[PDB]
Amino acid sequence: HMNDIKQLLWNGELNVLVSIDPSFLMKGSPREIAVLRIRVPRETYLVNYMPLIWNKIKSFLSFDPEKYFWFEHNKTPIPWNYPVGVLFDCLAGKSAVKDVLTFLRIHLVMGDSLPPTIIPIASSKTQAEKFWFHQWKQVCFILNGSSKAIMSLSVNEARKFWGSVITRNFQDFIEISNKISSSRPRHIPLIIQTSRTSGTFRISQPTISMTGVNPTLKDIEGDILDVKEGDVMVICQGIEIPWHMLLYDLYSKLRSFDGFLYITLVPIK
Amino acid sequence: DSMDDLLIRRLTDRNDKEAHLNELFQDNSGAIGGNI
């Protein structure tokens, strides 16, 4: 059922190897300082781990805490403002005394010339919450036609909503997310992306009306395929999704923790 | 339900595979979700 499925997504979790570039550290500091081996939920943001990072390297920093900070994967800038699982799917591709280790390698970097479209890691401890709540405000509007449902939550209710993401309180998350919208969607909050690993990466947020209709993924093939296509596998929440899958079902069950349903397109052959 | 059964099956498998060798990533064992 739905909640069982949502519980599986909530329990989603990855092995993440974080490396701190020497640029942040004092020449000669212990190896263990620049490395963190952690478990990170698919439904969260990498930025929620800055406190953990800072607390470990504080005593060995190479500066007094005008450079910018951001994450990278194999020398390629990676946006912190997407759920970790979505970043993973984008990097994994078809991947959806010797063993296969499934993990995400992340490197904390600094610099003066902030990379294109990259939102730097802030010192403002409400950066993620502010961005995330703004995500849900858009979602409420997309789903209900208005943002009334979310604006009506008490201030503490909204804080409790974000709080559940940090504490992993499934009950609270389900409680508030459902309150924002539990009716049938007017439109679907859908984001479509390709790979950040292979080829020319692209992302789109097509407008998809749901009033009086019940489209399948195939039905919206016009938003998924490009002009050149007029050989694509759809990956959502790290798994393969059939073309006959109903969009309402997909959204209502597999949407991410920021309220948006994300699909990753990967070449089959 | 069979579609839901398909979802559960693939998501469970996903979690299992992604949980493999988690013993090597225990530096935040007491704070999975990070911190405020």
Curated annotation (Swiss-Prot), chain A:
Pfam families tied to this protein: ATG5_HBR (PF20637), ATG5_UblA (PF20638), ATG5_UblB (PF04106)
Keywords of the record: Autophagy, Hydrolase, Isopeptide bond, Membrane, Protein transport, Transport, Ubl conjugation
Topology class, membrane: Peripheral membrane protein
Location(s), subcellular: Preautophagosomal structure membrane
Any single GO BP term: nucleophagy
One example GO MF annotation: enzyme activator activity
Glycyl lysine isopeptide (Lys-Gly) (interchain with G-Cter in ATG12), cross-linked positions: K137
Main location: membrane
GO CC terms: Atg12-Atg5-Atg16 complex; autophagosome; cytosol; membrane; nucleus; phagophore; phagophore assembly site; phagophore assembly site membrane
Gene3D superfamilies per UniProt: 3.10.20.620, Autophagy protein Apg5, helix rich domain, Phosphatidylinositol 3-kinase Catalytic Subunit, Chain A, domain 1
Post-translational changes noted in the entry: Conjugated to ATG12; which is essential for autophagy. Conjugation with ATG12 involves ATG7 as an E1-like activating enzyme and ATG10 as an E2-like conjugating enzyme.
Described function: Involved in cytoplasm to vacuole transport (Cvt) and autophagic vesicle formation. Autophagy is essential for maintenance of amino acid levels and protein synthesis under nitrogen starvation. Required for selective autophagic degradation of the nucleus (nucleophagy). Also required for mitophagy, which eliminates defective or superfluous mitochondria in order to fulfill cellular energy requirements and prevent excess ROS production.
Entry's family note: Belongs to the ATG5 family.
Subunit architecture: Conjugated with ATG12. The ATG5-ATG12 conjugate forms a complex with several units of ATG16. The ATG12-ATG5 conjugate also associates with ATG3.
Protein name as catalogued: Autophagy protein 5
Gene name as annotated: ATG5
Swiss-Prot record, chain B:
Subcellular location: Preautophagosomal structure membrane
Signal peptide: none
Domain of life: Eukaryota
Cystine bridges: none
Family note: Belongs to the ATG16 family.
Other observations noted: Present with 573 molecules/cell in log phase SD medium.
Assembly and binders: Homodimer. Part of the 350 kDa complex which is at least composed of ATG5, ATG12 and ATG16. Several units of each may be present in this complex. Interacts directly with ATG12.
General function of this protein: Stabilizes the ATG5-ATG12 conjugate and mediates the formation of the 350 kDa complex, which is necessary for autophagy. The ATG5-ATG12/ATG16 complex is required for efficient promotion of ATG8-conjugation to phosphatidylethanolamine and ATG8 localization to the pre-autophagosomal structure (PAS). Also recruits ATG3 to the PAS. Involved in endoplasmic reticulum-specific autophagic process and is essential for the survival of cells subjected to severe ER stress.
Name recorded for this polypeptide: Autophagy protein 16
Organism this protein belongs to: Saccharomyces cerevisiae (strain ATCC 204508 / S288c)
Whole sequence portion shown: 22 to 57 of 150
